[PDB]
From TrEMBL, chain G:
The chain holds residues 47 to 212 of 212 of the full protein. It is found in: Mitochondrion. This is Large ribosomal subunit protein uL22m. Keywords: Mitochondrion, Ribonucleoprotein, Ribosomal protein, Transit peptide. The keyword Iron does not apply. One of its GO terms (cellular component) is large ribosomal subunit. The keyword Ribosomal protein applies. Belongs to the universal ribosomal protein uL22 family. GO terms for molecular function: structural constituent of ribosome. GO terms for biological process: translation. It comes from Homo sapiens (Human). Its main location: mitochondrion. It comes from the Eukaryota.
Length: 297, 108, 51, 152, 148, 132, 166, 289
């Protein structure tokens, strides 16, 4: 905890991230072969021979066809959802998940984690630098509610204002600037010690890291990155940020009475490129998401 | 009437290569949900339709064996059975065609 | 206005020299090996001088 | 100028058109599933539905028997129509003769289709199913539906 | 024709006459035949005139190869890199002397359309024409139909 | 490249009647909201001057019919029905050609699912279902 | 007869230095003497020219022409030789670089016109060439906006000189 | 066939011409092409510049340190003892250092006594331009020291070409006095300044700040920019004229497409006029006293 400009903080954070990723890649010495199997439906019995801790499941979908690259959003390594750009470890059996599948609930949760994380990325770089922004967390709300939510403490100077429609449309236009550049959701699975050594300043991030490290016995939390943003989340993400097509932040709401300081919950709604809606239905969904989502218990 | 002059290759390339004569890219195409063999929207998948027509052909061959000659065409419903698969009580009067296979996991 | 193509060919060699001849092909090797040298199982274990 | 002019011109005349549709319809009543070009099965589907209506008028009706005697050219399909097809649709009103496009004929590249009577002891067609309710858009619309249900 | 061939602007190679003049010829490579009537004029040129030519302008290195050839040639190499090969097949002594003298005089630039035969490098002195030359100014720079 | 789409492509089996009922109820309420224009905030009504030109309508030609007068003659009439007519936007005198002011008038109601995005934005700003 | 498109797969480059880019793989394949006219085959070759190989197969599986099955066979076996022989590791990661059609050797017949007159009917044949290059398909050249038009016009006006004088 | 030989041979020579124009070979030094003799080329190099070099010092100047190390590497990969002449090659380092020092100080003296108003930093940038890599390589290439230079990697990378050009300057300084070498670098370097503006060689960044510093030295107060001539402010192709007035007196005037670039060009025009470097200056007096 010290005085730091907001840019040298992201410099030291993504430099430490790149150092840990280089160490993760360098720990394995050679090219080890793993035999990932395809236990899906369409092309059964296919067995790839991959490079261990190098090859992604996107690099397994590239072997088959281009449609496995276009429409597959999450992998399913043996029982567990694996994000499409995470290097495989052991000899496994794999299966790809799409948006128009029969039971897409896991990939819906993954999509809304990724959209809430994008909203945090677009909130944290839009405010005045003399004001302080502390990204608290994104609580895992179910997708049956209309919007994804992200929790942010604003400045002590700003316990009185609320944004008009122009600031919200500025937020969505910056989020569309984020969407228009096709960026990879890069993951990295780090120990709790290195992860706590990354952040070091946001005490809200510190207790969230401790909460996610307390539940597994190895103390490993899931870090992710879009470009130069680094955030904590539970579970996997979607591959690219260009999968989102219709994006919007709806409103903000203040939830005071549980705490002295004021936490502001930013809300917004999204839809992928394969599941886009007509303008009328989209305005209906945009209209519902202004109401406050409260599903935490 | 006859041509008065030979059309050159410049005029011909201007005619036979414009976007009104080129082949239009279509984008109705996606993978089939079962069997992944690249159907078109608004069109049944040719692989799945080939599956169904092969099984229908074998059922029709067994029907043609059971009906003897032509002009027979019974006055009862028919129903097909695979190996195992005892006739249900609701299919009592219905004609029973049993070929020999396991029941495939799309015909239920 | 009465003309056809040419060149009926085939792309696989075959066994014409025994179809009749009096010159046989003069080989300079054999097919495989006579009886395979089975090495000792611990050849890297006894990779020193002797035991 | 063919404003408001139904009934495509199919064969070599009006009578040849009726005979083409009659042969397609007789094949449909016998085999319960047909593939033919798309215009022909469109016309024959429009005829097949009212044939089922005439079969459902009854067996002792002389007009329905005359129509079944004309339109069915094999004369064993008349007991089949009056005792299997018409009792099968005793509850329904008009939803039968399901028609779907199959890709193309091999030689002359025609638009082909498949029609079948419902019921149909044959294996089922690979029908395209409407999208599942657990997807992203439908869960959003289900949230909206539940919200405006509780608001009422 | 001039639309069918390239063209260059009139130029010196390295500003010759400004400081010191330098001979722009480097080499002359002669290939004449011992036997063979086609190289008779060149044979007499090597007999009588190439020694005085070499003494005359000493910047040039001259080589005589004396090779069996049906057509003798002369290769003239210049300072800027260009190589000009000319055939002295069945020529006089006077024609070959004229040819090597003309090769000695010229510089290595291309003989193409030479395009505006003057190369002023600072053409204007009193100041080049712009539409506000020969135009008077008005009080406080007012434009036509102005008010203040 | 992006493929084509329509309104009910990705909708479920249960969501299509709900969306039909929802949008039908919404534009029925929007048509019923504009029913009393004189109580909202009407623009100033003027009396008739002799050099005046007023607005017209957009009707839908149903059919024809005979029609008799008191002398006995028979005339034929065309029945034009005014289905759903609404003034849409007004352009003042200096903004089109400097000659006469213009008024836009819309025809019968059609579906939102089959219009362009800017047209739907225009009717959403105005508050009416889209016109043909 | 000249067959050089077949011999282009036998080029062998020197081994690359470590401080160099990848040099993507290049695979040439062709099918000779197809019984199909070279213009109608050219329309399909122009359809493919820039697309990726899976998109090319998708467009050619649903195009209702005689040459479509032929080019689909050629592209499938070129994909197979690319993965097997020329050491492309991903089957999908190939784009069509060149795609064209040439004249093949034709035959001649009589057509028997309707008097004692005749024509020379010609039995047409053609080729199909294809060249695959591994890598993603290159992005299309975007149409020039008004900024580039204005910049080129101002560059043109800045380029001019006082002609026919010093 | 048609009988004969001459048309077939002529078509053969055309085939070799077309095939050589399709796949051109990588170019080779003139030392490896057939008509070449080194001693005659060094003598003719001395004679065409109208100079009198002592040929040992020129042969010293044309070798290079890389050539020495590469020749000893070639004689050691083959193992042949060439410690006879290679130990006495004496690479051109010291002659190049003498040549660079003399050329720098003599170009500085010429440019100081021609423009006594130009600042020290400007004359430093001008002698950095004339002794810069590009123009000494251009003069070196069109004076044929490139063909005589001993090195590896045939196109003679421009540091080595600059080094050997200043080495032959040093050889001329050794064999003849400072006046002859002064005349040499006059005729072959200062003529490269012809037809170039000042700030095509100095390449300054902020001309207005340098101009107000210059007027701070001359005790003239501060130039105020007043707009003089303009033709179309609303269009996309304007023309402006900004004049810089010092105590209600014009000192320069510069055109441009906006007001800012016209003001910057007016600063450039004043900054040229102060330094005694205008396009109307006395051209360089190439003569002999
Ligand atoms: Mg016909
Ligand atoms: Mg005859
Ligand atoms: Zn399928």
């Amino acid at each position: 905890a010290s005085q730091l400009s907001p840019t040298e903080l992201t410099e030291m954070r993504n430099d430490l991230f790149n150092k840990e990723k280089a160490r993760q890649l360098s720990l394995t010495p050679r090219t080890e072969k793993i035999e990932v199997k395809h236990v899906g439906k369409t092309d059964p019995g296919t067995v790839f021979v991959m490079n261990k801790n190098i090859s992604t499941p996107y690099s397994c979908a590239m072997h088959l066809s281009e449609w496995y690259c276009r429409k597959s959003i999450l992998a399913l390594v043996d029982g567990q959802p694996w994000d499409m750009y995470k290097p495989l470890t052991k000899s496994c059996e794999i299966k790809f998940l799409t948006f128009k599948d029969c039971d897409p609930g896991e990939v819906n949760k993954a999509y809304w984690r990724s959209c809430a994380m994008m909203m945090g990325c677009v909130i944290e770089r839009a405010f005045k630098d003399e004001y302080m922004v502390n990204l608290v967390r994104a609580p895992e709300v179910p997708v049956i509610s209309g919007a994804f939510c992200y929790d942010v403490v604003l400045d002590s100077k700003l316990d009185e204002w609320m944004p008009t429609k122009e600031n919200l449309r500025s937020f969505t236009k910056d989020a569309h600037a984020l969407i228009y550049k096709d960026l990879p959701f890069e993951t990295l699975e780090v120990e709790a010690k290195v992860a706590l050594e990354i952040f070091q300043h946001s005490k809200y991030k510190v207790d969230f890291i401790e909460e996610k490290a307390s539940q597994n016995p190895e103390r490993i939390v899931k870090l992710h990155r879009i470009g130069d943003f680094i955030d904590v989340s539970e579970g996997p993400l979607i591959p690219r940020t260009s999968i989102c097509f219709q994006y919007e932040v709806s409103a903000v709401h203040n939830l005071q009475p549980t705490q002295p300081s004021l936490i502001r919950r930013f809300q917004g709604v999204s839809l992928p490129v394969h599941l886009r809606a007509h303008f009328t239905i989209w305005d209906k969904l945009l209209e519902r998401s202004r109401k406050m989502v409260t599903e935490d218990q | 009437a006859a041509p008065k002059n030979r059309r050159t290759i410049e005029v011909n390339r201007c005619r036979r290569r414009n976007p009104q004569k080129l082949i239009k890219v279509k984008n109705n195409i996606d993978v089939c949900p079962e069997c992944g063999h690249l159907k078109q929207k608004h069109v049944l998948c040719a692989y799945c339709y080939e599956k169904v027509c092969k099984e229908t052909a074998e059922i029709r061959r067994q029907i043609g064996k059971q009906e003897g000659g032509p002009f027979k065409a019974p006055t009862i419903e028919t129903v097909v059975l695979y190996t195992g698969e005892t006739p249900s009580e609701q299919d009592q009067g219905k004609r029973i065609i049993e070929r020999d296979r396991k029941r495939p996991s799309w015909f239920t | 206005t009465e003309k056809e193509f040419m060149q009926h060919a085939r792309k696989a060699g075959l066994v014409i020299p025994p179809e009749k001849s009096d010159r046989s092909i003069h080989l300079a090797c054999t097919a495989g090996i006579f009886d395979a040298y089975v090495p000792p199982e611990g050849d890297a274990r006894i990779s020193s001088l002797s035991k | 100028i063919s404003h408001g002019r139904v009934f495509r011109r199919m064969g070599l005349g009006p009578e040849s058109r009726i005979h083409l549709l009659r042969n397609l319809l007789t094949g449909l009543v016998r085999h319960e599933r047909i593939e033919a070009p798309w215009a022909r099965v469109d016309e024959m589907r429009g005829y097949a539905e009212k044939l089922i209506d005439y079969g459902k008028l009854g067996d002792t009706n002389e007009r329905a028997m005359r129509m079944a005697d004309f339109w069915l050219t094999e004369k064993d399909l008349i007991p089949k129509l009056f005792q299997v097809l018409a009792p099968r649709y005793k509850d329904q009103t008009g939803g039968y003769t399901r028609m779907l496009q199959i890709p193309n004929r091999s030689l002359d590249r025609a638009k082909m289709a498949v029609i079948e009577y419902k019921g149909n002891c044959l294996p089922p067609l690979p029908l395209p199913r409407r999208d599942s309710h657990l997807t992203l858009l439908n869960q959003l619309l289900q949230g909206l539906r539940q919200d405006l249900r509780q608001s009422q | 024709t001039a639309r069918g061939t390239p063209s260059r602007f009139l130029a010196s190679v390295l500003h010759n006459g400004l400081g010191r003049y330098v001979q722009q010829l480097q080499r002359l490579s002669f290939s004449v035949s011992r036997d063979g009537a086609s190289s008779r004029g060149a044979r007499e040129f090597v007999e009588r005139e190439v020694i005085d030519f070499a003494r005359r302008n000493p910047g040039v290195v001259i080589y005589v190869n004396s090779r069996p050839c049906c057509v003798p040639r002369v290769v003239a190499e210049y300072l800027n890199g260009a190589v000009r090969e000319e055939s002295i097949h069945c020529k006089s002594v006077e024609e070959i002397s004229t040819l090597v003298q003309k090769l000695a005089d010229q510089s290595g630039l291309d003989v193409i359309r030479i395009r505006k035969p003057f190369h002023t490098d600072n053409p204007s002195i009193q100041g080049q024409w712009h539409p506000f030359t020969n135009k008077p100014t008005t009080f406080r720079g007012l434009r036509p139909r102005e008010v203040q | 490249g992006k493929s084509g789409t329509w309104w009910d492509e990705h909708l479920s089996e249960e969501n299509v009647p709900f969306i039909k009922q929802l949008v039908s109820d919404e534009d029925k309420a929007q048509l019923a909201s504009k029913l009393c224009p004189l109580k909202d905030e009407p623009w100033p009504i003027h009396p008739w001057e002799p050099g005046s030109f007023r607005v017209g309508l957009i009707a839908l030609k149903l059919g024809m019919m005979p029609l008799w007068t008191k002398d006995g003659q028979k005339h034929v009439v065309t029945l034009l029905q005014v289905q759903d007519c609404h003034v849409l936007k007004y352009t003042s005198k200096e903004n089109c050609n400097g000659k006469m002011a213009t008024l836009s008038v819309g025809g019968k109601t059609v579906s939102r699912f089959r219009k362009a995005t800017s047209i739907l934005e225009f009717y959403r700003e105005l508050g009416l279902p889209p016109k043909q | 007869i000249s067959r050089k498109w077949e011999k282009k797969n036998k080029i062998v480059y020197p081994p690359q230095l470590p401080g160099e880019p990848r040099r993507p793989a290049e695979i040439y394949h062709c099918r000779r003497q197809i019984k199909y006219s070279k213009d109608k085959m050219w329309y399909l070759a122009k359809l493919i020219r820039g697309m990726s190989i899976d998109q090319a197969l998708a467009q050619l599986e649903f195009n209702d022409k005689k040459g479509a099955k032929i080019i689909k066979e050629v592209l499938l076996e070129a994909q197979d030789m690319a993965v097997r022989d020329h050491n492309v590791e991903f089957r999908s990661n190939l784009y069509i670089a060149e795609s064209t059609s040439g004249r093949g050797q034709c035959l001649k017949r009589i057509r028997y016109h309707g008097r004692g007159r005749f024509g020379i009917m010609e039995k047409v044949y053609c080729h199909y060439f294809v060249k695959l290059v591994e890598g993603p398909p290159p992005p299309p050249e975007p149409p020039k906006t008004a900024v580039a038009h204005a910049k080129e016009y101002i560059q043109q006006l800045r380029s001019r000189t006082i002609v026919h004088t010093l | 066939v048609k009988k004969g030989f001459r048309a077939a041979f002529r078509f053969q020579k055309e085939l070799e011409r077309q095939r050589l124009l399709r796949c051109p070979p990588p170019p080779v030094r003139r030392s490896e092409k057939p008509n070449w003799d080194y001693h005659a080329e060094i003598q003719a190099f001395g004679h065409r510049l109208q100079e009198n070099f002592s040929l040992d010092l020129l042969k010293t100047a044309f070798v290079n340190s890389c050539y020495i190390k590469s020749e000893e590497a070639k004689r050691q990969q083959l193992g042949i003892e060439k410690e006879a002449v290679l130990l006495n090659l004496k690479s051109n380092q010291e002659l190049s250092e003498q040549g660079t020092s003399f050329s720098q100080t003599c170009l500085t003296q010429f440019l100081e006594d021609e423009y006594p108003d130009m600042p020290t930093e400007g004359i430093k940038n001008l002698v950095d331009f004339l002794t810069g890599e590009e123009v000494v390589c251009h003069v070196a290439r069109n004076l044929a020291v490139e063909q005589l230079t001993l090195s590896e990697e045939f196109p003679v990378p421009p540091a080595v070409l600059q080094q050997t050009f200043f080495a032959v300057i040093g050889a001329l300084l050794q064999s003849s006095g400072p006046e002859r070498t002064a005349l040499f670098i006059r005729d072959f370097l200062i003529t490269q300044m012809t037809g170039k503006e000042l700030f095509e060689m100095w390449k300054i960044i902020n001309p207005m700040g340098l101009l107000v510093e210059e007027l701070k030295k001359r005790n003239v107060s501060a130039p105020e920019s007043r707009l003089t001539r303009q033709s179309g402010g609303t269009t996309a192709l304007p023309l402006y004229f900004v004049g810089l007035y010092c105590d209600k007196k014009l000192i320069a005037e510069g055109p441009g497409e906006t007001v800012l670039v016209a003001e910057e060009e007016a600063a450039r025009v004043a900054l040229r006029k102060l330094y005694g470097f205008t396009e109307n200056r006395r051209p360089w007096n190439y003569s002999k006293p």
